[PDB]
Design a protein around this ligand. Sequence first.
Ligand code: HEM
Ligand SMILES: OC(Cn1cncn1)(Cn1cncn1)c1ccc(F)cc1F
Length: 441
Amino acid sequence: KTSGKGKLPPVYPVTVPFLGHIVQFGKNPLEFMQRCKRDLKSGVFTISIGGQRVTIVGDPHEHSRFFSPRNEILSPREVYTIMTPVFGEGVAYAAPYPRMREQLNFLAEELTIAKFQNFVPAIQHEVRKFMAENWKEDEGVINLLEDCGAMIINTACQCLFGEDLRKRLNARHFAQLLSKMESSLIPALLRLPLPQSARCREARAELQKILGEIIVAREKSDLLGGLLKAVYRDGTRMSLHEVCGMIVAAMFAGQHTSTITTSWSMLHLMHPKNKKWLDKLHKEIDEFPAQLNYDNVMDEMPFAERCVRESIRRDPPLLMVMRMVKAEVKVGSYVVPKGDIIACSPLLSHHDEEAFPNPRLWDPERDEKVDGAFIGFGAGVHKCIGQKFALLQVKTILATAFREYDFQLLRDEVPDPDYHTMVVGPTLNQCLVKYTRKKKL
Ligand code: HEM
Ligand SMILES: OC(Cn1cncn1)(Cn1cncn1)c1ccc(F)cc1F
């Protein structure tokens, strides 16, 4: 059972039992969680979605307690059921953890620092190719958020998709399918049974078929190829279904998190308030040639990476990460019982006054004042596997972009975090920016 002296973290009083806190938690979770933490004199607290127990680890010191326990204790599968139609049955979380671990490990091996051999030139190539087309005028106005999403997807494909695949699967067209597979991840039913999404099913099968054809044609380097060579610890290869899933996951995971990190970063540096930091950025990328190489970005862009880190810290794209509690776990002084859902919020954590004084301030030179406080890319057993690539990708984009362009916000102050989904980026209708082409002669 327990048992039986299991303590329980303070519960926040709900005005409406049936409602839960959803009405508030949606409008602005930050203020809400920040309020609970303050009033309950405890960084670790439990709130209820309607008729449900949810314990939030909002104490930076306690991140270990959340990220270190293995799936057997804290299981993510139950929470992320929703994504199964997207990743597929028996893929990722949907599958048993012994297999899941393997699947991800294979994807990881494909995004390792080892594979970045030509990635940089590939990225830099696609970026310029986009700027030339969509930013013709010497001085014009565009939407940064929409444009970063395009650069990200195009860039990623140039890296992880082979010549044959790209021509067959148009880069933009892939985002078309990717977007349809999400038309079902806009919740919006939690108490009732799960319904299938026609949009998602079709778009995935449309992608799976295409991929299927390439494999046949390929049968008389890229992520897809890398995945084919894959063999399990029992002597089994990944099926088309499983391969398609991993790729979809890789692209889904990257698209939204990176396009937001890239947007936020450009937005800060862009603001006159952050002129100083823009100067030290140019100190860094001015002496670089027009053609960047792996070394330039990986080992010669330290400040640039700091900007990206701080942008992820201040406004983490991933609101919370959650897991189903199967067994008792110790958290600080308190404890969380079986059956509950334990969450951990980068957003709340990154705003702890002790760990990040003045958390709404964008300071690329700030440091964890509590070791481990930053969980932008997760931690422990579930560390992000696309981190290294995301950074290479984002840093390279920042360079090419600020190498031959100057940007100016049309708004007064940096955009507001647009909280709706678990994924949070800058407010779309505020990401309008005027670009002016740098002087040449
Ligand atoms: C800046 C961009 C990115 C951010 C901010 C980010 C953030 C995160 C976070 C917070 C987690 C923790 C998930 C959890 O605790 O449940 C995570 C895990 C993960 N990420 Fe990312 N990520 C990024 C890019 C990517 C990319 C590009 C990929 C694939 C290409 C990727 C693949 C994964 C996978 C497979 C996991 C879970 C694996 C595990 O549980 O060990 N991520 N990421
Ligand atoms: O957990 C994510 C996506 N999901 C989790 N919370 C909200 N959506 C994070 N993802 C990883 N990097 C960026 N996003 C994930 C975990 C594993 C995975 F394979 C894909 C995937 F999106």
